[PDB]
Design a protein around this ligand. Structure first.
Ligand code: SF4
Ligand code: SF4
Ligand code: SF4
Lengths: 628, 628
């Protein structure tokens, strides 16, 4: 089968074959037929009595592990641990952001750039703002956010966009969230040998844990990032590997933590570093981003996006990356080995993400700007080691428009508001187009790449099908970057791919049919948006014609995201089967019984066209339930 | 191979074969040859690009996972997740204890029974005590303990017995602990795909996480349990399955959390329940404990111990267990199936541990005594369903002495203190016998059973070898219960098994050669003891001739325990190989490089006699280093 639908990706794969280096596709081929027990989730290693593998087919073979655990128990515990790991990644990101907020000052490297957003957040956290210094408010808000992570007494703080009905449903179900780290610890405790051996209770614990990701960790990370670095607005950028410059220093920012990439962007305008780039024979400094850190700097500053997850290696294959600076998460360790075949300096910066044989330059949060400057200086000085005979940059780049935060979307919707009617600054125009049926619904396309799927194929096919069916699409993460590379993040795309209702809406509001809402933590924005719509219509989020899709997901973070999206009341389609087919009870809970609990459920569909059809049918069913 | 060295265990295995019921041994046999990849730790399932298996033999076969992770990376992440799971189990136990402390009242079900212990703990937590109400002090202490779990700013609180040198070494190494749930979340975050791919850093993160178990979670759980339920003192009890009564109601308490078992013990003396037991035709109520909850109630009240981990099923096989009340952890789910073959009521009580097809009676912490009375009444009423023709109780039980908390040990040591010299109430006599060489050292024997080892064989052989070599032995958990069943927890054992120096010490102090220090969380007591000795000698804990042994461990909790014991500076022998042989770098870190870091290291030895020899040699070389 084809490795990708992206032509630049294919050219660089040919180059990697010529250079004798191996990619993620080569390692996937080397893995051959993957273990059936692990693929079905019926393998357990939770204690040293094991490893235990039970039959994925009930009634045949070994039925129980040594402790007596059934296939359903093993599957449910494995699923819960995936959710806990994803929640941990997102919560650690949000915790770093909250600490950065706590360390803001007027004359420091980290300031408050959006005071209005900070005051609204302070209102949401019961922090007084009138007649107060802005940094005192910021510190109080950071304290409340940090308490959300580890409070042992009392209730956590949740955003006002979350409907009261959803909160009450969670409380009745027993999944109402506690402090984030406490829920992660609870999930890890209940999967220990000889604890929870009941699939339904295990799934409910995992949902409870995922809620602390969706509504607390990711939400606080996003809102505090907006406070410190600015709320995203409509902004132009370029996407795909063609953004690399042969005649300039190329600095590629990979990872998830935004403070480092923000400081690197600021350092790139330093006169001394620009002069240094000129002195090593380069035209200038060309910052390019990848994955979620690329999404953040692109949403807030228009930094060009070099590529998504499965392109990271190919960025090095060009031979033009002088410095690849990585913080945490979704950083293929093979990059270190790959960096030996080129001049590239592979720089790790976080104590959480040491990588063997990489150059470690710890990013100092006490002096973020100076630390970023020294890291960037190492990248710039590496330009002298460039071998221009090994350089091949495909001439394939695509224009994209992004920056669609909830605030930006509301500002755009204000155009189609009659002044004599109003109100302004609400999601009411979006609610109106959804209720009238001009738009059939809204769908979130999120997730990673996965060698099991032709890279970016499922993302593009799902998005095109949805917008052709007058479903407005919001995108995050690597799916958003696939849309950017393909050319869907363009106003012109409205008349090229969208159906009649969505084309009319795009023309009236002057937006692309596909709205890039940011990184994987920025999925919280989507929740926020949906919540607002629900609160405007006086219904729960499970009554709306909305859906989420993860066509090509790979990470534990994706599992946690899908779990909290379903738990919030939004049906979720998974384009890659999770390792649960071995447990019939777990499959039945996730795809059938979940609808009785939270009004939504998982759909597993590896065919994107069938997924689009199912999404449209489900949205029409919910519309008929709602009367619209 | 023999299944056990215990004769009562063998008789009940014959009965289980005659009854056509499966045991843990039968399921272990059914599992046959366990997966080599999982056994070596070279299998990874951390993302849905996998499952990935790399060769346990370097230089052959597949070398890297799909993301590029090496065998060392996969092994180190798997080990770290085991540590995180064990830390989560212990920390959740301690968190429940702290919450119970927070709800103590003068006229409530949960009171303060050891005010002196509470005042000393309050001193350790910087809580004022002079001229204050005892329950105000208790609530402040509980608040400080709870803050240890989830504080995001500042430093955690550690017991005064921990040497300053050990803390400084931890700070220099980068493993100084943070809040417990924060460290669990950090480990889970760094094992996520594309985060940490460096074995040394991964092992250091796991050590940092395990410290929050050893010195914060388990320590606080133990000390708060002492405050609420009484400090253990020397007390007599009986051990092994013979403690069951044919003519009495048999109520078996299995699990770890002590509040439920304490309330059940209190409810058993209720006049209405005793009258009800008489009216259902029984002579009375016979409470028996298993595993750690049995250890707690036995340490504090002399409740008879029915058996350790791999005996739990056999307790039901007797046909005499009218009620089996379980809370969390090390509860084989197969019990639910097994109790169908008998009249036994298998009662789950904790929302953390639901077991399918068991009778769920949620233990209400708000009204603990009434809830315990209701559960106990269900067990008593089940006596009418006893089938006395199916009853077979082995006439095999053994006298044991336990209750050796640090306070009790100090009280015993006061006997050999010359009044004209002093001081009293110190560990000084123990330090003196260790320094003079009358005792060669002290060894902690802890851990579970494991079907991979003849049950209780390794525990007994290791203990007998150590005490024969004039090494005083402290025991916890299932190892302590194996010692109890065998008969080592007896004063007479001093003249039957101990060497000359240990026999003299036992005669002078009037103690058994093997000291039962309580449950698995009570391993913190051992740390406390060692710390005091170190603080009395002005040395670090790694300079002492001390060691820990886990001859037959199975649980993730055991992994976390061994990790924090080594990190504290105490060499640890493992009688069951952990899944790390696939990663040569991880093996080298755990067994060789750890000594450079923390002055102690792991020893993997499956032969108990060889383990005793190695322990004696290591203790002698540490003595020669210390000059004693
Ligand atoms: S999933 Fe289990 S059975 Fe399959 S290779 Fe991995 S450890 Fe072995
Ligand atoms: S927890 Fe149970 S099923 Fe899992 S490895 Fe241990 S004995 Fe086997
Ligand atoms: S994290 Fe890497 S090694 Fe582990 S399953 Fe995913 S791709 Fe394979």
């Amino acid at each position: 089968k084809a490795k990708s639908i992206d032509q630049a990706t294919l050219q660089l794969l040919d180059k990697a074959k010529q250079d004798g280096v191996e990619t993620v596709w080569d390692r996937k081929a080397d893995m051959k037929v993957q273990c059936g027990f692990g693929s079905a989730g019926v393998c357990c290693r939770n204690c040293s009595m094991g490893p235990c593998r039970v039959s994925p087919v009930p009634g045949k073979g070994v039925e129980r592990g040594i402790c007596g655990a059934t296939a359903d128990v093993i599957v449910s515990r494995n699923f819960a641990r995936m959710v806990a790991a994803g929640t941990a990644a997102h919560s650690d990101h949000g915790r770093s952001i909250a600490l950065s907020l706590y360390h803001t000052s007027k004359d420091g490297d980290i300031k408050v750039k959006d005071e209005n957003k900070l005051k609204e957040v302070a209102k949401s956290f019961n922090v007084e703002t009138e007649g107060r210094d802005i940094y005192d408010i910021a510190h109080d808000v950071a304290k409340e956010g940090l308490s959300n992570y580890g409070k042992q007494l009392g209730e956590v703080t949740l955003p006002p966009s979350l409907p009261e009905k959803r909160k009450e449903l969670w409380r009745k179900l027993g999944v109402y969230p506690r402090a984030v780290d406490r829920e992660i610890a609870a999930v890890m405790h209940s999967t220990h040998i000889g604890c929870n051996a009941d699939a339904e209770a295990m799934i409910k614990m995992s949902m409870r844990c995922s809620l602390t990701d969706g509504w607390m960790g990711s939400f606080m990370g996003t809102e505090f990032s907006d406070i410190m670095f600015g709320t995203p607005h409509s902004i132009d950028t370029e996407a795909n590997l063609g953004v690399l410059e042969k005649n300039s220093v190329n600095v590629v920012l990979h990872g998830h933590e935004p403070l480092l990439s923000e400081m690197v962007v600021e350092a790139a305008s330093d006169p001394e570093l620009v002069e240094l780039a000129k002195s090593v024979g380069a035209d200038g400094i060309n910052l390019c981003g990848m994955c979620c850190t690329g999404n953040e700097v692109s949403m807030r500053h228009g930094i060009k996006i070099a590529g998504n997850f499965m392109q990271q290696e190919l960025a090095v294959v060009t031979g033009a990356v002088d410095g690849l600076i990585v913080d945490v998460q979704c950083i293929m360790p093979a990059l270190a080995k790959l960096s030996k075949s080129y001049h590239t300096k592979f720089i790790t910066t976080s104590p959480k993400a040491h990588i063997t044989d990489s150059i470690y330059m710890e990013f100092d949060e006490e002096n973020p700007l100076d630390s970023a400057k020294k890291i960037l200086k190492e990248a710039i000085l590496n330009f002298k080691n460039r071998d221009q005979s090994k350089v091949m940059i495909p001439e394939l780049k695509c224009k994209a428009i992004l920056g669609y935060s909830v605030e930006e979307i509301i500002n755009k919707l204000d155009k189609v508001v009659n002044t004599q009617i109003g109100p302004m600054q609400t999601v009411k125009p979006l609610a109106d187009v959804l209720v009238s049926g001009v738009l059939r619904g809204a769908a979130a396309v999120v997730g990673c790449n996965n060698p099991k799927v032709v890279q970016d194929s499922a993302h593009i096919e799902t998005i095109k099908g949805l917008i052709k069916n007058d479903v407005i699409v919001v995108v995050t993460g690597c799916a958003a970057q696939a849309a950017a590379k393909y050319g869907l993040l363009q106003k012109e795309a409205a008349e090229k791919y969208a159906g009649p209702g969505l084309a009319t809406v795009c023309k009236l509001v002057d937006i692309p049919p596909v709205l890039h809402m940011g990184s994987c933590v920025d999925i919280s924005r989507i929740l926020d948006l949906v919540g607002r719509v629900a609160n405007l219509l006086g219904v729960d989020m499970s009554d709306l014609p909305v859906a989420g899709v993860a066509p090509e997901w790979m990470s534990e973070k994706a599992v946690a995201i899908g779990t909290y999206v379903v738990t919030s009341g939004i049906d979720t389609w998974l384009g890659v089967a999770p390792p649960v087919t071995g447990g019939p009870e777990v499959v039945d809970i996730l795809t059938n019984k979940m609808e009785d609990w939270v009004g939504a459920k998982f759909f597993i569909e590896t065919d994107p066209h069938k997924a689009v059809e199912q999404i449209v049918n489900r949205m029409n069913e919910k519309r008929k339930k709602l009367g619209i």
